[PDB]
mmCIF file with all atom_site columns, C-alpha atoms in Angstrom:
data_model
loop_
_atom_site.group_PDB
_atom_site.id
_atom_site.type_symbol
_atom_site.label_atom_id
_atom_site.label_alt_id
_atom_site.label_comp_id
_atom_site.label_asym_id
_atom_site.label_entity_id
_atom_site.label_seq_id
_atom_site.pdbx_PDB_ins_code
_atom_site.Cartn_x
_atom_site.Cartn_y
_atom_site.Cartn_z
_atom_site.occupancy
_atom_site.B_iso_or_equiv
_atom_site.pdbx_formal_charge
_atom_site.auth_seq_id
_atom_site.auth_comp_id
_atom_site.auth_asym_id
_atom_site.auth_atom_id
_atom_site.pdbx_PDB_model_num
ATOM 1   C CA . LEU A 1 1   ? 122.580 102.762 138.065 1.00 51.43 ? 28  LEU A CA 1
ATOM 2   C CA . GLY A 1 2   ? 122.711 98.545  137.112 1.00 52.35 ? 29  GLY A CA 1
ATOM 3   C CA . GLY A 1 3   ? 126.232 98.367  137.929 1.00 50.91 ? 30  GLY A CA 1
ATOM 4   C CA . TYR A 1 4   ? 128.204 96.741  140.392 1.00 52.19 ? 31  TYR A CA 1
ATOM 5   C CA . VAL A 1 5   ? 130.517 97.615  143.224 1.00 48.27 ? 32  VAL A CA 1
ATOM 6   C CA . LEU A 1 6   ? 132.595 96.336  146.623 1.00 48.54 ? 33  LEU A CA 1
ATOM 7   C CA . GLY A 1 7   ? 131.319 95.311  149.777 1.00 47.24 ? 34  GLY A CA 1
ATOM 8   C CA . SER A 1 8   ? 133.273 95.696  152.827 1.00 49.49 ? 35  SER A CA 1
ATOM 9   C CA . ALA A 1 9   ? 136.000 93.303  153.271 1.00 50.65 ? 36  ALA A CA 1
ATOM 10  C CA . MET A 1 10  ? 135.341 90.504  155.705 1.00 52.21 ? 37  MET A CA 1
ATOM 11  C CA . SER A 1 11  ? 137.994 88.273  157.538 1.00 51.58 ? 38  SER A CA 1
ATOM 12  C CA . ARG A 1 12  ? 137.654 84.619  156.895 1.00 53.93 ? 39  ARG A CA 1
ATOM 13  C CA . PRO A 1 13  ? 134.232 82.984  157.016 1.00 55.74 ? 40  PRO A CA 1
ATOM 14  C CA . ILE A 1 14  ? 134.553 79.758  159.667 1.00 55.17 ? 41  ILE A CA 1
ATOM 15  C CA . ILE A 1 15  ? 133.771 77.831  155.894 1.00 57.47 ? 42  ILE A CA 1
ATOM 16  C CA . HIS A 1 16  ? 133.215 73.848  156.186 1.00 57.02 ? 43  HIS A CA 1
ATOM 17  C CA . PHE A 1 17  ? 133.516 70.901  153.534 1.00 57.77 ? 44  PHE A CA 1
ATOM 18  C CA . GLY A 1 18  ? 132.597 67.227  153.584 1.00 54.96 ? 45  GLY A CA 1
ATOM 19  C CA . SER A 1 19  ? 136.575 65.619  154.189 1.00 55.53 ? 46  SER A CA 1
ATOM 20  C CA . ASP A 1 20  ? 139.696 66.096  156.080 1.00 56.74 ? 47  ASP A CA 1
ATOM 21  C CA . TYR A 1 21  ? 141.657 66.587  152.919 1.00 58.29 ? 48  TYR A CA 1
ATOM 22  C CA . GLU A 1 22  ? 138.828 69.856  151.586 1.00 58.44 ? 49  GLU A CA 1
ATOM 23  C CA . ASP A 1 23  ? 139.205 71.566  154.559 1.00 60.95 ? 50  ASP A CA 1
ATOM 24  C CA . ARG A 1 24  ? 143.660 70.883  154.331 1.00 60.46 ? 51  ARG A CA 1
ATOM 25  C CA . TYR A 1 25  ? 143.095 72.341  151.005 1.00 59.04 ? 52  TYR A CA 1
ATOM 26  C CA . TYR A 1 26  ? 141.002 75.189  152.299 1.00 58.24 ? 53  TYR A CA 1
ATOM 27  C CA . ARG A 1 27  ? 143.118 75.681  155.306 1.00 58.91 ? 54  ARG A CA 1
ATOM 28  C CA . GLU A 1 28  ? 145.961 76.019  153.123 1.00 57.71 ? 55  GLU A CA 1
ATOM 29  C CA . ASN A 1 29  ? 145.048 78.314  150.416 1.00 53.71 ? 56  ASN A CA 1
ATOM 30  C CA . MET A 1 30  ? 142.426 80.652  151.604 1.00 51.28 ? 57  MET A CA 1
ATOM 31  C CA . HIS A 1 31  ? 144.558 83.272  151.498 1.00 51.71 ? 58  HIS A CA 1
ATOM 32  C CA . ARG A 1 32  ? 144.470 82.642  147.689 1.00 48.44 ? 59  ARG A CA 1
ATOM 33  C CA . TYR A 1 33  ? 140.442 83.418  148.307 1.00 49.76 ? 60  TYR A CA 1
ATOM 34  C CA . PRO A 1 34  ? 138.079 87.135  147.824 1.00 47.68 ? 61  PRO A CA 1
ATOM 35  C CA . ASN A 1 35  ? 137.477 88.646  150.926 1.00 48.64 ? 62  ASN A CA 1
ATOM 36  C CA . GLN A 1 36  ? 135.604 91.416  150.036 1.00 49.22 ? 63  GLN A CA 1
ATOM 37  C CA . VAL A 1 37  ? 132.257 90.878  146.818 1.00 48.48 ? 64  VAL A CA 1
ATOM 38  C CA . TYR A 1 38  ? 130.979 92.773  144.794 1.00 49.36 ? 65  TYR A CA 1
ATOM 39  C CA . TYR A 1 39  ? 127.342 93.221  143.700 1.00 50.10 ? 66  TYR A CA 1
ATOM 40  C CA . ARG A 1 40  ? 124.579 94.538  142.576 1.00 49.24 ? 67  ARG A CA 1
ATOM 41  C CA . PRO A 1 41  ? 122.514 96.931  144.395 1.00 46.85 ? 68  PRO A CA 1
ATOM 42  C CA . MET A 1 42  ? 119.372 96.578  142.208 1.00 50.87 ? 69  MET A CA 1
ATOM 43  C CA . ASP A 1 43  ? 119.505 93.320  142.638 1.00 53.93 ? 70  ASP A CA 1
ATOM 44  C CA . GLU A 1 44  ? 118.006 93.630  145.813 1.00 53.98 ? 71  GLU A CA 1
ATOM 45  C CA . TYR A 1 45  ? 114.641 95.201  143.700 1.00 52.38 ? 72  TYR A CA 1
ATOM 46  C CA . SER A 1 46  ? 114.471 91.270  142.744 1.00 52.43 ? 73  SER A CA 1
ATOM 47  C CA . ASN A 1 47  ? 115.414 88.123  144.217 1.00 51.05 ? 74  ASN A CA 1
ATOM 48  C CA . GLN A 1 48  ? 117.299 87.128  147.305 1.00 53.91 ? 75  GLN A CA 1
ATOM 49  C CA . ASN A 1 49  ? 119.310 83.969  145.220 1.00 51.03 ? 76  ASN A CA 1
ATOM 50  C CA . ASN A 1 50  ? 119.096 86.410  142.614 1.00 49.60 ? 77  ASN A CA 1
ATOM 51  C CA . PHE A 1 51  ? 121.261 88.754  144.468 1.00 51.18 ? 78  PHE A CA 1
ATOM 52  C CA . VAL A 1 52  ? 123.863 86.187  145.429 1.00 52.04 ? 79  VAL A CA 1
ATOM 53  C CA . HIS A 1 53  ? 124.321 84.381  142.484 1.00 49.63 ? 80  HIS A CA 1
ATOM 54  C CA . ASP A 1 54  ? 125.211 87.476  141.493 1.00 52.22 ? 81  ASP A CA 1
ATOM 55  C CA . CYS A 1 55  ? 127.449 88.988  143.263 1.00 50.04 ? 82  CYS A CA 1
ATOM 56  C CA . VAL A 1 56  ? 129.196 84.944  143.956 1.00 47.32 ? 83  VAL A CA 1
ATOM 57  C CA . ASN A 1 57  ? 129.140 84.474  139.545 1.00 48.31 ? 84  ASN A CA 1
ATOM 58  C CA . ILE A 1 58  ? 130.951 88.000  140.001 1.00 50.04 ? 85  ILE A CA 1
ATOM 59  C CA . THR A 1 59  ? 132.758 87.953  142.521 1.00 51.17 ? 86  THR A CA 1
ATOM 60  C CA . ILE A 1 60  ? 135.294 85.039  141.473 1.00 51.32 ? 87  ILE A CA 1
ATOM 61  C CA . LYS A 1 61  ? 134.863 85.611  137.721 1.00 53.88 ? 88  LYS A CA 1
ATOM 62  C CA . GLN A 1 62  ? 136.589 89.480  138.566 1.00 54.37 ? 89  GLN A CA 1
ATOM 63  C CA . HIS A 1 63  ? 138.589 87.373  141.575 1.00 54.79 ? 90  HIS A CA 1
ATOM 64  C CA . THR A 1 64  ? 140.103 84.977  138.347 1.00 51.68 ? 91  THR A CA 1
ATOM 65  C CA . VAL A 1 65  ? 141.553 87.567  136.197 1.00 53.24 ? 92  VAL A CA 1
ATOM 66  C CA . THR A 1 66  ? 143.209 90.156  138.733 1.00 54.91 ? 93  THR A CA 1
ATOM 67  C CA . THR A 1 67  ? 144.878 86.445  139.615 1.00 52.77 ? 94  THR A CA 1
ATOM 68  C CA . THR A 1 68  ? 145.628 85.691  136.285 1.00 55.73 ? 95  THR A CA 1
ATOM 69  C CA . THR A 1 69  ? 146.808 89.218  136.245 1.00 53.79 ? 96  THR A CA 1
ATOM 70  C CA . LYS A 1 70  ? 150.085 87.780  138.579 1.00 52.66 ? 97  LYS A CA 1
ATOM 71  C CA . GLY A 1 71  ? 151.035 84.786  135.836 1.00 52.42 ? 98  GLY A CA 1
ATOM 72  C CA . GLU A 1 72  ? 148.377 82.227  138.601 1.00 52.33 ? 99  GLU A CA 1
ATOM 73  C CA . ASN A 1 73  ? 145.505 79.997  137.741 1.00 54.33 ? 100 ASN A CA 1
ATOM 74  C CA . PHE A 1 74  ? 143.100 78.368  139.667 1.00 52.25 ? 101 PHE A CA 1
ATOM 75  C CA . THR A 1 75  ? 141.775 74.963  139.744 1.00 54.75 ? 102 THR A CA 1
ATOM 76  C CA . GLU A 1 76  ? 138.456 73.579  139.723 1.00 58.60 ? 103 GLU A CA 1
ATOM 77  C CA . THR A 1 77  ? 139.062 72.085  143.351 1.00 57.99 ? 104 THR A CA 1
ATOM 78  C CA . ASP A 1 78  ? 140.276 75.455  143.755 1.00 55.51 ? 105 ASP A CA 1
ATOM 79  C CA . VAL A 1 79  ? 136.965 77.784  141.966 1.00 52.77 ? 106 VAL A CA 1
ATOM 80  C CA . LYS A 1 80  ? 134.664 75.032  143.539 1.00 54.15 ? 107 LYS A CA 1
ATOM 81  C CA . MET A 1 81  ? 136.495 76.840  147.161 1.00 55.38 ? 108 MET A CA 1
ATOM 82  C CA . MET A 1 82  ? 135.330 79.738  145.989 1.00 58.16 ? 109 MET A CA 1
ATOM 83  C CA . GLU A 1 83  ? 131.667 79.149  145.532 1.00 58.81 ? 110 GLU A CA 1
ATOM 84  C CA . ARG A 1 84  ? 131.921 77.555  149.080 1.00 59.70 ? 111 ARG A CA 1
ATOM 85  C CA . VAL A 1 85  ? 133.528 80.410  150.850 1.00 57.93 ? 112 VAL A CA 1
ATOM 86  C CA . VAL A 1 86  ? 132.061 83.859  148.342 1.00 61.15 ? 113 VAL A CA 1
ATOM 87  C CA . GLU A 1 87  ? 129.038 81.936  148.394 1.00 61.33 ? 114 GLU A CA 1
ATOM 88  C CA . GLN A 1 88  ? 128.734 82.704  152.025 1.00 56.75 ? 115 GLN A CA 1
ATOM 89  C CA . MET A 1 89  ? 130.348 85.681  151.889 1.00 57.93 ? 116 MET A CA 1
ATOM 90  C CA . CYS A 1 90  ? 127.427 86.591  148.930 1.00 60.22 ? 117 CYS A CA 1
ATOM 91  C CA . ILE A 1 91  ? 124.325 85.753  151.521 1.00 61.10 ? 118 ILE A CA 1
ATOM 92  C CA . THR A 1 92  ? 126.311 87.758  154.056 1.00 60.27 ? 119 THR A CA 1
ATOM 93  C CA . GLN A 1 93  ? 126.227 90.964  151.695 1.00 58.03 ? 120 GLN A CA 1
ATOM 94  C CA . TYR A 1 94  ? 122.875 91.078  151.209 1.00 56.19 ? 121 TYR A CA 1
ATOM 95  C CA . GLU A 1 95  ? 121.451 90.088  155.050 1.00 54.97 ? 122 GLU A CA 1
ATOM 96  C CA . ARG A 1 96  ? 124.344 93.223  156.002 1.00 56.05 ? 123 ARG A CA 1
ATOM 97  C CA . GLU A 1 97  ? 122.284 95.424  153.077 1.00 54.79 ? 124 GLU A CA 1
ATOM 98  C CA . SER A 1 98  ? 118.954 94.220  154.488 1.00 55.83 ? 125 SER A CA 1
ATOM 99  C CA . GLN A 1 99  ? 119.623 94.650  158.157 1.00 52.77 ? 126 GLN A CA 1
ATOM 100 C CA . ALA A 1 100 ? 120.497 98.326  156.722 1.00 53.67 ? 127 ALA A CA 1
ATOM 101 C CA . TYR A 1 101 ? 117.882 99.440  154.763 1.00 53.53 ? 128 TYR A CA 1
ATOM 102 C CA . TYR A 1 102 ? 114.535 98.006  157.116 1.00 49.04 ? 129 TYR A CA 1
ATOM 103 C CA . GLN A 1 103 ? 116.550 99.527  160.046 1.00 49.16 ? 130 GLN A CA 1
#
């Protein structure tokens, strides 16, 4: 009941950073980041901020576990990048959950 599930796979959202360097790094590395997020249906009984931050934390940690198994490593830069895009994908997921709930 309190577990996580995966939401639908998403196409690459447009994500803007503060610098040319970051945007270029992001464009060249985004293929390595998640396009589907883990979220907790019970968090819909809590606030939006909690749902999102749980989704960000579990999504990035599970993806790290999956990535490690392929002999690969994420740098601090990669995690910062993933935090940005995964946060937007988690909000999208929430908004889709909300739309369904009220529709």
